[PDB]
RNA sequence: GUUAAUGUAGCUUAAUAAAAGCAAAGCACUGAAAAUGCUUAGAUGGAAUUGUCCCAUAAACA
């Protein structure tokens, strides 16, 4: 029953989300975040974290995305955040690495689409 | 004060060096993919022609194979660039020097630079100047002295009098350090290619 | 004209989002609404890089990671800090200590035993039904000798 | 203080692909050096067999910049590819619409 | 270096198989070129 | 059709080739930068000795180009 | 030695809670370039406190 922002019609992406998944691919590493509308990060999975680095081969990779997504999902399940909003760009959505990452989250049980609000 | 000008001539390399093995294998890779993308006895005659090329001598990629010692010759190197470099004797010094000539403030660097081209080589060499900006200036004292190092490129060269009594040597980089010990003369590499 | 122009949409987006975070004069939406470990770390990395099998799996895009190993290592390194975020996010530090914040350091573990075959864990923010919490839960938190404790639920 | 004119480069080579491959390389080197390339036009076949010639336009040079550029071109040349440097001699709605305001 | 741009690949979406041949110049230099038939050598007259 | 081992060999040498070119580009880029700085250093040196000569020299040569040489 | 440069990776007054971001490179995609996708290489040669020494060691003097 909580409010989701419904405006920003002229801007992309829409802000009608309780939670959002932000995936940033830098030169080194690749980071995935879950952030509330108020701007506080709740669950963060990054390739710059010691534990993930030792078990991976390269900071940036297609499998990396997959692996960090699986790690992110378990933390997301751990935090109890089951429903989330993902807003990829057209090329990013088509990117194979991001497609695989979404598959990991779907397999993990994290729903990439939030349910409609109750009025 | 002693006013002295000089020129660092450049001769382009005519023929390339051989490809590295990694470069060779990549040529196979671009060829094999080309075959993959390709769209579907004269050979004996071509075989006869290829051996006709083999028997016929082509100019070597490097023209040192016969020479091995022709520093005085213009065609000292073909794989890399050359620099004119002539033994000179000064009033208080006897050093292996870059070509030098006497310059005046009225004469611009190119005018002296042009005179350097033919004054010390006395040949029908063809060289070009791109910018009037000089490339090196070095001062050696015993009495104050300064030498201006210019840069030029050899368009072509008909080097007459190959066997001069002078010790003109064309050096790319190997003989620069060997013959020019002091930095004032061994730092020519800084503006050399 | 001197400055270069963004050649891709993403560059502007990354610049824009970073730009939004910075405070500004104009009103905006946001206002109203050790060394040895480093050396050892590096050495392990080099060994991982050397391993040809790691390269082959990565280029074959079949590699994977063990989640359990990462989780335990994550607990040692920065689990305290991430746990603090959840506590602040969930309001524990404001409702419990009237705004005082304490970083959790003891890797506390709790799970509700369902029968005897399996036991439901209690992580941060987890969902557990009251039926599952009928009986008291097993607690193991790796105290070490001495250092008396008090547990409060 | 004077600014170089825009100098066209006609790259003439037996093979179109090699001419294109050299044409791109100078462009990327030009782009890395911040040299603007307005056009990459292609000449017709040199019927006699034929050869293929490709233009890489280069606009803007400096005395020091020109010297450092050209010798690099000599080095970049694979050999057997013939260089050339020569001084050079429809509008859409936004361009016309702006153009009216200037003279109106 | 002349080898900087020497190694290059075709930019054609469709083309028959190209065969390597060398063109002999009057100064003796040689160039690797692509020809439609499996010839071995070419000579500049 | 290539076997996975055949692709593996070609891909492996491709990785070496990509690394080699990156090494080649980095060396050349610094080499060009150094030469220009030396030319700029050469510009500075005679300015100390005589800046007046540069007033004529710093001007570009309009007649230098066109220049053709393969 | 006098003068005087100099010790995060091209750049940064990134960082001591976790050695970062940016710049930069290759292949694929065909007008070129760019974009996009897949890939690549690296660090403190240092102590200092803010928001200079002292070494490696560069030189003019020497």
Structure notes:
The structure is cut from a larger assembly and holds chains A (119 residues), B (193 residues), C (153 residues), D (104 residues), E (45 residues) and F (70 residues). By secondary structure, chain A is α+β, with helices and mostly antiparallel strands. Chain A has helices spanning 50-54, 62-79, 90-94, 96-108, and strands at 19-25, 30-36, 41-46, 85-86. In chain B, strands 1, 5, 6, 7 and 8 form a five-stranded mixed β-sheet that branches. Chain B has a three-stranded antiparallel β-sheet with strand order 4-3-9. Chain B has helices spanning 21-37, 42-55, 64-67, 109-119, 174-179, 183-186; strands spanning 2-10, 38-39, 83-89, 94-97, 100-101, 124-128, 136-138, 145-158, 169-171. With 193 residues, chain B is α+β, with helices and mostly antiparallel strands. Chain C has seven helices and three strands; from the N terminus they run H-H-H-H-H-H-H-E-E-E. In chain C, a hairpin with a 3-residue loop joins strand 1 and strand 2 (118-121). By secondary structure, chain C is mainly alpha-helical. With 45 residues, chain E is an all-beta fold. Chain E has strands at 15-16, 19-24, 30-35, 41-43. In chain E, strands 3-2-4 form a three-stranded mixed β-sheet, with no helix packed on it. Chains in contact: A-C, B-D, B-E, B-F, D-E, D-F. At the A-C interface, strand 3, helix 1 and helix 2 of A face helix 1, helix 3, helix 4, helix 5 and helix 6 of C. Chain A binds one RNA strand of 62 nucleotides through residues 26-29, 48-50, 58, 60-62, 91, 94-97. Chain B: One of its GO terms (cellular component) is cell junction. Chain B: GO terms for molecular function: structural constituent of ribosome. Chain B: The modification N6-succinyllysine is found at residue 164. Chain B: Keywords: Acetylation, Mitochondrion, Ribonucleoprotein, Ribosomal protein, Transit peptide.
In short:
This is part of a larger assembly, with chains A (119 residues), B (193 residues), C (153 residues), D (104 residues), E (45 residues) and F (70 residues). In chain B, 29% of the residues lie in helices and 25% in strands.
